[PDB]
Every structure is written in structure tokens, then in C-alpha cells.
Amino acid sequence: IATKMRLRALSRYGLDTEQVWRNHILAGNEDPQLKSLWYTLHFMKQYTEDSLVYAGIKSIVKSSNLN
Amino acid sequence: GEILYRWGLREKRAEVLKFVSCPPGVYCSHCRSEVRGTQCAICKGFTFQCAICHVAVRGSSNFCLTCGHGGHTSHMMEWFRTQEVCPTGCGCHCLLESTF
């Protein structure tokens, strides 16, 4: 893991705030886990720009042709 | 030496004057006290800490007057060669405050 962290830092991993999901293309080759986080973060971010979205779906669908 | 100063050579004036027989507030990170020197007097520790390098500075340095962050001279020389922000994320364009 230490070797991977070295190549991640050299390729400016994590600092692209314009488009978020493009980070998973900078992480390396393929990781289903790491290609799921950024997509899960991109959809959350582009809804406060158009605060409770960060709470997760559990709090959303607990206090509750669809609602 | 005065003649050499008139001509325009300042290194060779110092070299000559070196042979004359007769002679001619950094905050600490452990106790937050005004210490004048490279070593503290209360906790007896290093007071200056490089803002790029985090190895204690005992020799030459430079810093911004308002932000008060600086370190080894070559370190800031490389850093400020291409950017314009305080390296410790302070928000000052020290190039406009350090240089009058």
C-alpha cells in the first residue's frame, strides 16, 4: 500500500474540485470500491448547488406517484 | 574601502575591511513566549521551525512581517519562485507584505 500511495500523490490525486468523479480515473487501474466513492460523492455535491443530502439515505427514508 | 564602495564593488570592500583590528523576537512552540535567539530559555528548546521543512532553523532565514511564517532561505526561495500564498495556508500574499 505504501508504494501505491506514492504514485497517487505524484498524479495530483484528490484535488480536482471542478469535476469530482474524475478522481477515480486518477487512482490507478481499477478498484470497484474507489470507483464508487467518488461517484457517490459527485451526486451528493451537485444537489446543494441547486445540506441534508450528506446525512445518508437512512435518515432520508426513515422519517416518511411517489413521495 | 570607501573607494571600493564608490567604484561599485561591495564584496571586495567587505573582504578588505575584514582585516581591521578594532570591531565595527521569535515565538517558541512550547511555551508561547518571546525568545530572542535560536534556543528557548524557559523550556530550553528550538523556537523557529521551518514552514516548508519542519527542521529547526539555527542559521539564516527570512519571514513575512505580518503572517510571521518563514524558514530556511533556500526553501522559501524555491517555494515563492512560482506561487504567491503563505505556505502554511494563511492567505497572505507575502510577496506584497515582506517586500516593501
Binding site: 500500500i1 505504501a2 500511495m5 | 528557548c40 523550556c43 530550553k44 528548546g45 528550538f46
Partner: protein, 302 residues
């Protein structure tokens, strides 16, 4: 997937110990000719020694550097009951105040993590571990005597806990070297209550009986548990998850192999706490790592 190579350092006597600073740019080498040397690493990559001096009467077992935030300081240990603190002035390595206050020979010398001062942890063969403190960082000539530890056994190896959180007090591990048939213990763990400034006993690994030669804690890196290495005839990696007097650690055992068929001398971790190198008296050494199933497996013996 490790590819071995060779270096271009030429010596005269044997080599007993080596150590790396913090940045992996300098190292200190021992030699059974009453001499120690340090080498820099040129930008091109070629090494070149830049120091050599006799330091004691006999042989020097260990040299360990210090954290650079206190300059460039070394710490050597010798057979003839001594433990000194070297410094550097620039060049010439003028020795600071050597301090020997033991009776037997000192077994090992290791520094302390940088987050609590400039402590030092000499231990001797008789079973006395001594703690030195220097609250005069501007001048490293004065050393006090904080709490010493008595265990009434033999001491071979010492190890600290590199954890830096404010939720874990410092801990000391101690290794024996005795071959006595009284097989009771071989590795104890000490702790530190802040309310008494003493050193109690935390636990005891009543699962290793053969002589132990080296103990190396694994770096923390934020995990919720700690890891130790025990260099017996079998290489062993334990595990303690603190439960919620001293704290009650619940031990385990996660690996025990013997694919070296020799006397496993020393073990030490890497910077990131995943790969662990193990040595022995069988010619060439092995590298251990953890796989996807969290079941440690060999990784490239060479």
C-alpha cells in the same frame, strides 16, 4: 517481487549493526575493530563514508539515531558497561557527555518517540532498564534518572510504541535471553499510569519459551490495535485490541511459521506497517506480508 542488488561499500572488519536516520539518506555502521562510520548518499546515488573514530574499549553492539527535530544525535552501546550520546559539530564528531551508571553489560539502547521529549531507554543484562531525560535540548550534556524498571530476569531486546494518539500511554516491551529450563515467560509489556508516574505490568506472553533475540513494534498508522514481532525459533506476529490499574489487552496469535530452519535473530517493520522483514542464521532471509484474506503469507525469500 523484490529484486536484490549490491552496494559499493568497502570495510575491513565485521559488521555488527546498521541503522537509518529518518529520511533514508544517512546510516551508521558498527565494526568489531572499535570503530563506527557514517556514509552519505550522493545525488547520483553513490555512497561515501565521512566519519571514523574509536569510541570505546572493545566492541559496540548498537547505534541508533535520533529524531532530526533535535539535530543529529546518535546513541551507542558497548560490552564494557557503558552508554554514550554522540553529537556533531561542523566534520568532527565531538562526543558529548557519556553516562554509564549500570553494573553489568548493557544489552540494548533505543530512543523514544519525538512526541514526549528526548528520553532514552538503556537496558542492561542484569534486568534493569534505565530511562534518561534531557530537558535542556539547547545543550545535550545533562541527563537525569526517571523511573527505572525491575523485572528480575535477563534482558535482550527493547521496543517502544510509536503510537502518537492521546488515547494510548507509552508502552515498553522487554525480551529475555536465558536458556534456563524454568520456562515461564519470555516477553513482558509495561505501561504508564499518569496518576503515579510509575511503570506497572500490563500483560505477559506466556506462549514463547525459546530464547528471544529481537522485538519490533509495528507502526500505528491510525489502527485500533497494536502489533508485535517476536524473533524466536518461530517468527510470531501477535495482536492486542485494548478493552474498555493498567488496561486489559486481549492477546491473539495470527502467524507462526518456521520456514528458515535456523536461529531467527532479528525482525523489524517498515514505515507503513504492512511488510515485515525477518532474519536468521540460514544464509538468506524472507519477507512477510498480508494478503486479501488477511492471512499472512511469504513474499519473495531472497
Amino acid at each position: 517481487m523484490f529484486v536484490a542488488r549490491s552496494i559499493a561499500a568497502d570495510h575491513k572488519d565485521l559488521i555488527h549493526d546498521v541503522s537509518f536516520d529518518f529520511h533514508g539518506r544517512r546510516m551508521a555502521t558498527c565494526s568489531s575493530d572499535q570503530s563506527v562510520k557514517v556514509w552519505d548518499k550522493s545525488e547520483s546515488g553513490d555512497w561515501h563514508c565521512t566519519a571514523s573514530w574509536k569510541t570505546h574499549s572493545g566492541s559496540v553492539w548498537r547505534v541508533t539515531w535520533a529524531h532530526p527535530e533535535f539535530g543529529q544525535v546518535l546513541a551507542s552501546c558497548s560490552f564494557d558497561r557503558t552508554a554514550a550520546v554522540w553529537e556533531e559539530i561542523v566534520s568532527h564528531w565531538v562526543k558529548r557527555t557519556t553516562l554509564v551508571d549500570s553494573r553489568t553489560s548493557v544489552t540494548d539502547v533505543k530512543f523514544a518517540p519525538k512526541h514526549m521529549g528526548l528520553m532514552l531507554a538503556t537496558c542492561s543484562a542484569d534486568g534493569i532498564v534505565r530511562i534518561y531525560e534531557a530537558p535542556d535540548v539547547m545543550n545535550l550534556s545533562q541527563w537525569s534518572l526517571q523511573h527505572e524498571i525491575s523485572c528480575k530476569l535477563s534482558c535482550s531486546c527493547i521496543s517502544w510504541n510509536p503510537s502518537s494518539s492521546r488515547a494510548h500511554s507509552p508502552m515498553i516491551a522487554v525480551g529475555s535471553d536465558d536458556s534456563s529450563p524454568n520456562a515461564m515467560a519470555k516477553v513482558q509489556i509495561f505501561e504508564y499510569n499518569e496518576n503515579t508516574r510509575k511503570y506497572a505490568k500490563a500483560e505477559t506472553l506466556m506462549t514463547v519459551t525459546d530464547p528471544v533475540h529481537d522485538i519490533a513494534f509495528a507502526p500505528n498508522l491510525g489502527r485500533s490495535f497494536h502489533i508485535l514481532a517476536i524473533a524466536t525459533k518461530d517468527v510470531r506476529i501477535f495482536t492486542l485490541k485494548p478493552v474498555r490499574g493498567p488496561t486489559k489487552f486481549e492477546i491473539h496469535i495470527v502467524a507462526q511459521f518456521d520456514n528458515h530452519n535456523s536461529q531467527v535473530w532479528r525482525v523489524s517493520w517498515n514505515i507503513t506497517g504492512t511488510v515485515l522483514a525477518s532474519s536468521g542464521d540460514d544464509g538468506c532471509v524472507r519477507l512477510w506480508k498480508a494478503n486479501y484474506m488477511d492471512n499472512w503469507k511469504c513474499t519473495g525469500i531472497l
